[model samples]
Target: MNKVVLLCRPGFEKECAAEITDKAGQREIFGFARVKENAGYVIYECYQPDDGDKLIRELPFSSLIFARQWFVVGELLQHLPPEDRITPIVGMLQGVVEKGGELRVEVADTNESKELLKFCRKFTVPLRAALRDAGVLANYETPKRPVVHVFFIAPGCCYTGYSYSNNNSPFYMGIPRLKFPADAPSRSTLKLEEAFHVFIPADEWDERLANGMWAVDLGACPGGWTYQLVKRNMWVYSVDNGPMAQSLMDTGQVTWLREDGFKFRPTRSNISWMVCDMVEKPAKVAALMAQWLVNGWCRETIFNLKLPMKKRYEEVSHNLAYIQAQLDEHGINAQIQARQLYHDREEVTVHVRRIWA
Candidate 1:
């Protein structure tokens, strides 16, 4: 059986494994994921040739909730010495990629391997030199093909794999190490910012979030989410009974509404976007989201669901499914995407957009 590597947040390895297994099953590639809880990674052992490649092709990187990044394991090199690590890696990558393919060296996010990050940084130059000598290093800065990923799980063990640049996260391990701005209301702003980066394409954002467009933010107290809308120069109705930061109100772009998020409806029916982050059960929040989309209250939505302490993966799957079912019940055409973002804990972010049929 061929093994595929999955990178994810630590302590959620089980979720990553469970979700990948389900997606693989849907593609008729049945497999079990080998997981070490809190290990920050999982391996799915597939039963057929190129099954890993086939599985990745069927699943878009954005649709995954727990998995941060994934790649097809091409070779495993064990007992690698720091002095001679390059030769084996070169041998493993031979003919797997064109001479101009990109490469990245990585280490799993584990307690014992924390120091490997520095090692990877220091070793990259020599590794590139070796690859150049072997005629496999790409001279160009931009890679046009799948990147060769070499993941070091331990001091001497590594899994060499490849992932299509489009099918995997561009950020290191899919974790955007975001810097909180000075005037943002809370660290929570990063979550929404990261969502935009992950869900919305950069070029399309100017058109999608055009100045003077309208938006609604439910449970927008303290204006963390409102800050994003304001910064984009979009008129926003921030609906929350709770206190909001005065600086946000000073922006003059936000209008604070003292009302329940679930009960609040926009004065304008064709608002460009709606965002929510209320503290409530996931299914209830999902139902509210479905209600908005099914009624065409807003064209697009970005929200967060606080996961339960147990069966977090199953809970996300069921809640998202419920939202889909609710929309379908109302004859809505919609697209949904979910992810456990780097800034999130015990929660997952979801993006929904209604499609005109």
Candidate 2:
């Protein structure tokens, strides 16, 4: 395969394309990106054969900010015969992959692809059985083998690909299926909930997101972000000028502070988590987060950087670099990651964890 396919938010195809181009260039792998506006995907085609495979295997998937899921793919399988589509797809993978762990039949994340999604769902069952019987996939799903991906872009057009099991996003379509909590203060609660799922590893949640840990929530009006912390049985100090939700206040786990989020500092020294979803300039929010981390105010934090209408990818990179430089200057060892999450809009969620070494 000489092409790499990436799934992203529909409107941000350019950013995803730009990101993959830059990342591939950094690895000395030259490629040009194919972007269809609002297509919800990008195709980075390498000039040299095997470069696509090298990029997918060499690049650390977790470091990518815009791409949700990616895999090495071949030329688009076009104009398949409807009566027996399975034969062509099986033939495409016959010599390419042997005993792939799983099969995912997917479509782009666009309204235009809604009908294709339904077709993909029904097609998965037969496709999976066919792939297994053809020796392209294992009889039983396992995590140690590559994940086969058949991304359908139209009624009969699709791309056959595979992503390494260890490097790929485990969620279907690179999105976690989270139902909105019935009693949560607002729909915004899902943002933080999704951040936890994306930023923290499942095995480390018990140690990192444990119960009774103290948390601070800035701009926590109506307690949307605070709700996630409280749900985890954490004591929260919710700071905002606006009033919080009565439902969250009655829980007795939240301490509402009617103050400016920018000026408020936590009284508790043992705060384990600090989460911010404030609506402010991206640079300003980045600076405040850097200050909190530099001062050792919290062990870890998740914050949102509200982006401008233009040059969003540049803005995100600038702010993230600023934070990294500040942390390095202060001689702090930390792991920093940012993502334009499934729940986020016009902003990206950033997670920073300080390591005591």
Candidate 3:
């Protein structure tokens, strides 16, 4: 017998569970009444063979979670008293943790005598810390996707990947290029660097940037994101009326162009990306990105959408829709997503992909 373990966001668990039950329909789902809800995850037992509960669990679960959701039934069973460790309970749970399953412990004494945890040691636990150590369940405490690349920036610091190596995070990939060791770093720039990591989720990152591609940076005068792209050996066209980091362009792979980014069009369509860190309003930059897709200028794009500190989510949600509508109105059904990147500050990065049909 197998079981499926489904973890959900703090407040979103009910909706997540409802989705699972609706998909199961009439099967009783290993004695479960089709729609079982919990504060975090819902578990389903596999009394019978060939159940598909696990497939439904990952559809909406975002990145950042460990997927250690898989649990060995015997270990969890040990947590139960010798009398309650019935064969039926064991069989039911086994089904839920199978390849594609969803279930969270709802009625359990999640708050237990520490003895329960000690008994379950044989079976693997999802996290090293107990709920007691972790405190109340919330979005931050709740796990997310498989990976996230973090770039922790601090003043008077010259470093890369230090945040990850220090073991401060549960999920971390790489640190992008950041000017650290500068004397008296601009406090405004440092402020943005410190704030961006707070809201970003960790599991949504893929540390690969295709090498040998070309990227045109608009208003990339300072070269924050440009450095990340260029470090990959990609050609970077730095376009801005303001000055750029001289060290970045000195690498010879980078080109300096002083011009209005919105007015400048790619002379050819071979460019792979257009990254905008320009100080222009989100709508304005979004419109330019929309135009790039409409014209088939690039196959992919990674641009920033800066939102006001207050109403941050509201502003980001609205602007993303506006960009999507602009692209959709132009018949561009690009694979696009706007997320709070691990390296963002009061802004989200919109990564768009135009793939061959």
Best by TM-score: 2
List lDDT for all candidates, in order.
0.83, 0.91, 0.47
lDDT by residue for model 2 (1-357), tens? 789989998899899998889988998999899789999999999989999888888898888888888889987899988898999999999989998999999999999899989989899999999999999999999988999999998889999989997787887888888999888988999999988998898789888888999999999998889999998899999999999999999999999899999999776789899999999888999999999999899999999998789878887999999999999999999999888889887888999998876
Candidate closest to the true structure, highest lDDT: 2
**Full ranking by lDDT:** 2, 1, 3
Question: Is candidate 1 or 2 superior in lDDT?
Answer: 2
lDDT of 1 at 148: 70
Please give, for residues 145-165, the per-residue lDDT of candidate 3 as tens digits.
Answer: 211111111111111101111
Off by over 4 Å in 2: none
Least well predicted 10-residue stretch by lDDT in candidate 3: 156-165
Candidate 1, 301-326: lDDT as tens digits: 99999999888988889999999898
Higher-TM-score candidate of 1 and 2: 2
lDDT accuracy of residue 269 in candidate 2 = 85
Question: lDDT (0-100) at residue 290 of candidate 3?
Answer: 82
